[PDB]
Design a protein around this nucleic acid. Sequence first.
RNA 1: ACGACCAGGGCUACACACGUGCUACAAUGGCGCAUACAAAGAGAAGCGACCUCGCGAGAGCAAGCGGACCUCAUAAAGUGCGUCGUAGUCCGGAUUGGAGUCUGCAACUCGACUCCAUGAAGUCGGAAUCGCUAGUAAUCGUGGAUCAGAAUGCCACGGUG
RNA 2: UCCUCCUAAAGAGUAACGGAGGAGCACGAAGGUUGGCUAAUCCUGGUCGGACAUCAGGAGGUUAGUGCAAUGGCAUAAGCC
Lengths: 177, 115, 82, 66
Amino acid sequence: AKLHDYYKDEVVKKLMTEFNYNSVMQVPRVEKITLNMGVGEAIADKKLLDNAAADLAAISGQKPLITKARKSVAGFKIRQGYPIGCKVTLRGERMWEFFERLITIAVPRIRDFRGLSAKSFDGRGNYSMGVREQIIFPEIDYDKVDRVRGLDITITTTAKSDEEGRALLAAFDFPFR
Amino acid sequence: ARIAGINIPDHKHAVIALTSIYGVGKTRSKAILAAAGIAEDVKISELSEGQIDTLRDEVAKFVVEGDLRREISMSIKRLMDLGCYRGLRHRRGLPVRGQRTKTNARTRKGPRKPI
Amino acid sequence: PRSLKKGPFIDLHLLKKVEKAVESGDKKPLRTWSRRSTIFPNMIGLTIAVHNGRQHVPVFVTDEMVGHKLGEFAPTRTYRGH
Amino acid sequence: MKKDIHPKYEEITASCSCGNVMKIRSTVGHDLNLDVCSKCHPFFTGKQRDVATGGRVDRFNKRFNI
RNA sequence: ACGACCAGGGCUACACACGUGCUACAAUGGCGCAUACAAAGAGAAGCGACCUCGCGAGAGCAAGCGGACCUCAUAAAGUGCGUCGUAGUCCGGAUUGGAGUCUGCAACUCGACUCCAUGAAGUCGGAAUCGCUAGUAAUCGUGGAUCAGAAUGCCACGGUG
RNA sequence: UCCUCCUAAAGAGUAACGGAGGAGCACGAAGGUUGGCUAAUCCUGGUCGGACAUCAGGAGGUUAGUGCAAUGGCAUAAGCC
Ligand SMILES: [Mg+2]
Ligand SMILES: [Mg+2]
Ligand SMILES: [Mg+2]
Ligand SMILES: [Mg+2]
Ligand SMILES: [Mg+2]
Ligand SMILES: [Mg+2]
Ligand SMILES: [Mg+2]
Ligand SMILES: [Mg+2]
Ligand SMILES: [Mg+2]
Ligand SMILES: [Mg+2]
Ligand SMILES: [Mg+2]
Ligand SMILES: [Mg+2]
Ligand SMILES: [Mg+2]
Ligand SMILES: [Mg+2]
Ligand SMILES: [Mg+2]
Ligand SMILES: [Mg+2]
Ligand SMILES: [Mg+2]
Ligand SMILES: [Mg+2]
Ligand SMILES: [Zn+2]
């Protein structure tokens, strides 16, 4: 709740000034944090599904969703109803207590870290980002990972454009470039 | 254990253990443990913690995992992109320092490979 | 590499020629049969043509080349592939 | 939030060796330190170091002269 | 001109196959410290000790010798005390980058060597084949010839056996 | 022998060695009811992820689906939990 104690009191004091707004509704707001760590390789063992349904559950304290394949593709050995994906969604204050663990600790901890490039907003300001490995969230034991497989953080926000949604994250000195 | 970017095993000694970084062998590995006041047959385990707090200060005055790999794979691409003879021996995949390639260029040419 | 304390090598017949050719400016390509000279910094921005074994090959010399010798932009024997 | 099937969450200290004391709740249990602190990290003061290009006139005139 | 002078290239290229050798795949062994015993050679445009600067190749100064006098020259295997604990390993050094030394008009195609990095392939090798009957095979080092610099081959001598 | 559209002439019906297709089963839920939900497809961003796995909005609005052939239905969904 610490970053949200920072946000409502000391981000609107910039995002009201630099963008010519009337109300407190016109500033963008964060909406949700979603954590997809999909295992597309769980056809050879069910353990690779459920371990990938636990290894991101230990990061942020929720049991995750074993989401299924939507439609069918003959190529990649999938049909309607194969549990391949793992998803976590966070809203409200747990979003802030995870955003703290991302941007204070797990953002410089990644190997060969040189910032996160300035265009990942898909033209509407809703962010997307992707790690390559799990231990950079420091909440894992070292030699207690069966494999290495990253996830992708997606910060869905109420941003409206690429010019006007970026400054929200840049107000928390998001290590762009 | 987590020293300068990536981890270091604990059961090995200090001198053999610090060589797990990309860019320290058995010369800088005694430079660090003689410019930081540590012995050489104590492990990463049964150290203290401030010893790591100053060993991490000592290591990062060199060029390490990020900087070494970026400089080496910078210089290789620079040597490629002029037309230098080391550049052509890079971008053909053949030995560069003047080896005999009628036979025995195998470390650059990969495997033994019939037509 | 050379011993350093002898200094770098360059022929006289290319050193005097290049100090004349800077102070007469012409980018008519200067040809040479001396492919062993350490390229000097005041040779930056010249079109010389080094022998290769058969003919001259033209070399336009930039800032990047000035460590090396004039041979390493004339590949000697032709090769295409079996 | 369901009352049972989600794991533990308790406050634990996360200090760094450059002196960033902090508290965060997680499931890690033990007191967990930090190596790299982004209040002095080499991203805003330490990513110039790689470029290492140099004028070739400078590499020429560092080792000898005429 | 199939003669003769000169600069620069070429014999050293590489999709592959064969023959000969070196180094290993490790505990009868890696690494670090101390400690003993050889033989046969070579040297004036040469061998170049002592002393100082250099992390090291080596530059600095200048005695000694046509040599049972002086140099090259320290033998290594071994023996003692540690460390190591069966792992692609502190095994193995291939290949590549950065910085240097020397002979030499000149090390780009192409020289050896030392330091800092990098640490591939390989866990005793298929059918078939090779050498040896006592100071022998098997391993260990040293010298010489050709040579301004440049052999893991060639020719020599001993150490364990 | 049975089933679907057309020939069939705006109601039913109407033939040929005329023009095209499916059946001789399944389901203990794929049934009754309550509560709730809404698609195919391409663009853009993203860990291995590629033209097509999963995740994000976003356009578009049944161009999708029904245990199977067509034809007629279908949002109160008869489609999906
Ligand atoms: Mg190293
Ligand atoms: Mg080394
Ligand atoms: Mg000639
Ligand atoms: Mg020959
Ligand atoms: Mg063979
Ligand atoms: Mg040993
Ligand atoms: Mg001699
Ligand atoms: Mg000295
Ligand atoms: Mg070794
Ligand atoms: Mg080295
Ligand atoms: Mg192997
Ligand atoms: Mg074994
Ligand atoms: Mg010789
Ligand atoms: Mg013998
Ligand atoms: Mg009718
Ligand atoms: Mg049914
Ligand atoms: Mg796309
Ligand atoms: Mg219904
Ligand atoms: Zn720190």
